[PDB]
Design an enzyme around this catalytic site. Structure first.
Site, PDB file in Angstrom:
ATOM      1  N   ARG A  74     -21.041  13.608  -1.045  1.00  0.00           N
ATOM      2  CA  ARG A  74     -20.452  12.808   0.045  1.00  0.00           C
ATOM      3  C   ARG A  74     -21.458  12.682   1.173  1.00  0.00           C
ATOM      4  NH1 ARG A  74     -14.464  12.677   3.095  1.00  0.00           N
ATOM      5  NH2 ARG A  74     -15.309  12.502   5.207  1.00  0.00           N
TER       6      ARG A  74
ATOM      7  N   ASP B 221       0.836  -1.181   0.000  1.00  0.00           N
ATOM      8  CA  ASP B 221       0.000   0.000   0.000  1.00  0.00           C
ATOM      9  C   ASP B 221       0.896   1.265   0.000  1.00  0.00           C
ATOM     10  OD1 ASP B 221      -2.180   2.068   0.744  1.00  0.00           O
ATOM     11  OD2 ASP B 221      -3.295   0.196   0.723  1.00  0.00           O
TER      12      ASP B 221
ATOM     13  N   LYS C 296      -5.830  -1.982   6.598  1.00  0.00           N
ATOM     14  CA  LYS C 296      -6.215  -2.217   5.200  1.00  0.00           C
ATOM     15  C   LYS C 296      -7.170  -3.380   4.990  1.00  0.00           C
ATOM     16  CE  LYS C 296      -3.674   1.382   3.841  1.00  0.00           C
ATOM     17  NZ  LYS C 296      -4.317   2.678   3.421  1.00  0.00           N
TER      18      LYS C 296
ATOM     19  N   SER D 297      -6.635   4.594  -1.139  1.00  0.00           N
ATOM     20  CA  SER D 297      -6.815   3.178  -0.882  1.00  0.00           C
ATOM     21  C   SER D 297      -8.184   2.658  -1.275  1.00  0.00           C
ATOM     22  CB  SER D 297      -6.495   2.841   0.596  1.00  0.00           C
ATOM     23  OG  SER D 297      -5.107   2.952   0.811  1.00  0.00           O
TER      24      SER D 297
ATOM     25  N   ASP E  53      -1.490   0.191  -4.751  1.00  0.00           N
ATOM     26  CA  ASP E  53      -2.793   0.812  -5.036  1.00  0.00           C
ATOM     27  C   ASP E  53      -2.762   2.317  -5.268  1.00  0.00           C
ATOM     28  OD1 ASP E  53      -2.130   1.366  -2.206  1.00  0.00           O
ATOM     29  OD2 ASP E  53      -4.247   1.586  -1.776  1.00  0.00           O
ATOM     30  N   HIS E  54      -1.595   2.936  -5.039  1.00  0.00           N
ATOM     31  CA  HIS E  54      -1.279   4.354  -5.276  1.00  0.00           C
ATOM     32  C   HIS E  54       0.061   4.576  -4.506  1.00  0.00           C
ATOM     33  CE1 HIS E  54      -2.084   5.192  -1.088  1.00  0.00           C
ATOM     34  NE2 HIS E  54      -3.045   4.283  -1.265  1.00  0.00           N
TER      35      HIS E  54
ATOM     36  N   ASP F 134       2.168   2.953   3.238  1.00  0.00           N
ATOM     37  CA  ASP F 134       1.182   4.045   3.322  1.00  0.00           C
ATOM     38  C   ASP F 134       1.074   4.586   4.751  1.00  0.00           C
ATOM     39  OD1 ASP F 134      -2.295   4.823   3.061  1.00  0.00           O
ATOM     40  OD2 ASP F 134      -0.760   5.661   1.785  1.00  0.00           O
TER      41      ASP F 134
ATOM     42  N   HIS G  11      -0.503  11.016   0.029  1.00  0.00           N
ATOM     43  CA  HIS G  11      -0.329  10.167  -1.154  1.00  0.00           C
ATOM     44  C   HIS G  11       0.344  10.960  -2.316  1.00  0.00           C
ATOM     45  CE1 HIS G  11      -4.149   7.728   0.117  1.00  0.00           C
ATOM     46  NE2 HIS G  11      -3.147   7.573   0.960  1.00  0.00           N
TER      47      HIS G  11
ATOM     48  N   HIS H  59       2.505   8.245   6.005  1.00  0.00           N
ATOM     49  CA  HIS H  59       1.640   9.392   6.369  1.00  0.00           C
ATOM     50  C   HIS H  59       2.278  10.205   7.515  1.00  0.00           C
ATOM     51  CE1 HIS H  59      -1.874   9.183   3.741  1.00  0.00           C
ATOM     52  NE2 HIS H  59      -2.086   7.920   4.080  1.00  0.00           N
TER      53      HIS H  59
ATOM     54  N   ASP I 186     -11.439  22.040   2.828  1.00  0.00           N
ATOM     55  CA  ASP I 186     -10.834  21.322   1.697  1.00  0.00           C
ATOM     56  C   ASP I 186     -10.142  22.253   0.710  1.00  0.00           C
ATOM     57  OD1 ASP I 186     -13.962  19.508   1.723  1.00  0.00           O
ATOM     58  OD2 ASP I 186     -12.058  18.843   2.666  1.00  0.00           O
TER      59      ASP I 186
HETATM   60 MN   LIG Z   1      -3.662   2.632  -0.252  1.00  0.00          MN
HETATM   61 MN   LIG Z   2      -3.337   6.541   2.918  1.00  0.00          MN
END
Ligand SMILES: [Mn+2]
Ligand SMILES: [Mn+2]
Length: 504
Positions: free
Chosen positions: A256, A11, A329, A61, A437-438, A396, A455, A400, A153
């Site tokens: 959302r 991840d 995850k 994710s 996944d990124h 991941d 990310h 972070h 945001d």
């Molecule tokens: Mn991920």
């Molecule tokens: Mn993440």
């Protein structure tokens, strides 16, 4: 033993040219390197339009594991709605046109609610403009806009810009006006703080609130008191608010659910008791998506179920499968992998390993990777698995933290586990696809050495542990599941539109 095929998701682990703050490149990863040098390899896209996001938007994710399991591009709400606007279907939408017909037929009013920014997490204000154009086209006479201000945001004091551009829109189209203005702290609470919501409700309904002559004027007054966008106290715009009355319609353009649900229950949950209300009669209440099940709303963009995700195809070929990951995850390798479905497929089993309980994972960079690896070994030794979907969370979740040495250590522990896992699979005459996944851990420092905690938009590596084949030179996440079916020699159905990375 069956021959296993496994997808191994590292991840938040991507390809990036710069080595500066690049924990992927700085880490010692002899197993990854050995597999990478021995076996066929390529790189695929995991951000933006390739995974159903806006151009330039970093992957994540949830969107990642959805695209991976689906074997096709899974369009997320913002892109779906953007595309609907671009190709015209938006203006033909049944629900929006019924809302308008309710207004036109009662000579009542159309109210529009939403987060007025280009944040793109909860709404996009260009969707307001498309509603304004639709109302105008259908001859609606009275449009009231209830602005919920962002600052969270997007930059913390940016509301004046969106308000200005929106005012110019009302003038350009000859329709619409701001009727009330509220910080998202009030209108978009999600913690059942009904007192904050009641302030927004009271302004929306012309019941009780400060009044200002213009939206700009109230916002500047707020700024003068030290209260930025998010925290603007709801206010009414003088002479531009005639209430919400019987026969009106509302369209809420947020897509959302979490922060739009509460206000929507106030207006359209007949059982609402957060505070006392007299709900509007004959109210047509439309939401851009379905916020929850206690709101009597018409839903503009209904959820699409995904048929023939990888797990369903496996089931339907009488294969057995394992999903496995530590807590952080676990939903990704289960719910999101299965196309947003909690129920296990026939022949599916699952393994959850408890993540450590720390506030931040730099305190234990190995997390529970070793226990995940040991669980997988025990499962492989049973010999009854056709398909394995495994995620190592560490790169991941540690990345972070924005801290380079721990993120390196996270990667190195993952590399040790990858080695034992992949060698066993090869021991068993099986195949691994090793990928991500990124990105994230590929950049944990800004160029000036500050922590970077997000990310990335970088493409992700793919290694396929099958000899004497060549991979296609690029692709996208929606190609991984087709590659798995290729390895398993299972037929790919038509609704999986991705394509095997192995050339034929
Ligand atoms: Mn991920
Ligand atoms: Mn993440």
């Amino acid at each position: 033993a069956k021959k296993p095929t496994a997808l191994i998701i590292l991840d938040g682990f991507a390809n990036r040219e710069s080595e500066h703050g690049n924990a992927v490149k700085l880490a010692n990863k002899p197993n990854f390197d050995r597999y990478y040098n021995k076996y066929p390899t390529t790189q695929i896209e995991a951000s933006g339009l390739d995974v159903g996001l806006p151009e330039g938007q970093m992957g994540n994710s949830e969107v990642g594991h959805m695209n991976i399991g689906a074997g096709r591009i899974v369009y997320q709400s913002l892109t779906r709605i953007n595309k609907s606007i671009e190709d015209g279907d938006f203006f033909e939408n049944d629900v929006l046109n019924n809302a308008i017909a309710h207004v036109n037929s009662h000579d009542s009013a159309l109210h529009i609610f939403g987060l007025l920014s280009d944040g793109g997490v909860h709404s996009h204000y260009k969707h307001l403009f498309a509603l304004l154009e639709l109302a105008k086209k259908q001859g609606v006479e009275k449009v009231y806009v209830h602005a919920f201000l962002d600052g969270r945001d997007v930059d913390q004091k940016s509301a004046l810009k969106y308000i200005e551009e929106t005012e110019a829109k009302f003038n350009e189209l000859g329709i619409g006006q701001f009727a009330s203005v509220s910080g998202r702290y009030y209108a978009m609470d999600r913690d059942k703080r009904w007192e904050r919501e009641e302030k927004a409700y009271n302004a929306i309904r012309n019941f009780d609130a400060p009044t200002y002559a213009t939206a700009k004027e109230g916002v500047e007054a707020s700024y003068n008191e030290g209260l930025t966008d998010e925290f603007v106290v709801p206010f009414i715009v003088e002479n531009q608010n005639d209430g919400v009355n019987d026969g009106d319609a509302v369209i809420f353009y947020n897509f959302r659910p979490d922060r739009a649900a509460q206000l929507s229950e106030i207006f359209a949950n007949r059982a609402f008791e957060g505070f006392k209300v007299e709900q509007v009669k004959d109210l047509f209440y439309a939401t851009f998506t379905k916020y929850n099940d206690n709101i009597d709303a018409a839903i503009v963009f209904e959820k699409v179920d995904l048929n023939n995700t990888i797990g369903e195809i496996a089931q339907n070929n009488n294969l057995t499968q394992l999903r496995i990951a530590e807590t952080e995850k676990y939903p990704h390798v289960t719910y999101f992998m299965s196309g947003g479905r909690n129920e296990e497929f026939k022949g599916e089993r699952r393994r959850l390993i408890d993540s450590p309980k720390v506030a931040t994972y730099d305190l234990k960079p190995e997390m529970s990777a070793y226990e995940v690896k040991d669980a997988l070994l025990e499962e492989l030794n049973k010999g009854d698995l056709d398909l394995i979907i495994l995620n190592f969370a560490n790169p991941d979740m540690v990345g972070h933290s924005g801290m380079l040495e721990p993120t390196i250590k996270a990667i190195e522990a993952v590399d040790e586990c990858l080695g034992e896992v992949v060698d066993k699979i090869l021991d068993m005459d099986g195949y691994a696809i090793i990928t991500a996944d990124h990105g994230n851990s590929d950049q944990v420092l800004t160029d000036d050495d500050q922590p970077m905690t997000t990310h990335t938009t970088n493409p992700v590596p793919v290694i396929v542990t099958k000899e004497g084949v060549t991979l296609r030179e690029t692709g996208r996440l929606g190609d991984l599941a087709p590659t798995l079916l290729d390895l398993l020699n299972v037929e790919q159905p038509e609704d999986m539109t991705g394509e095997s990375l192995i050339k034929h």
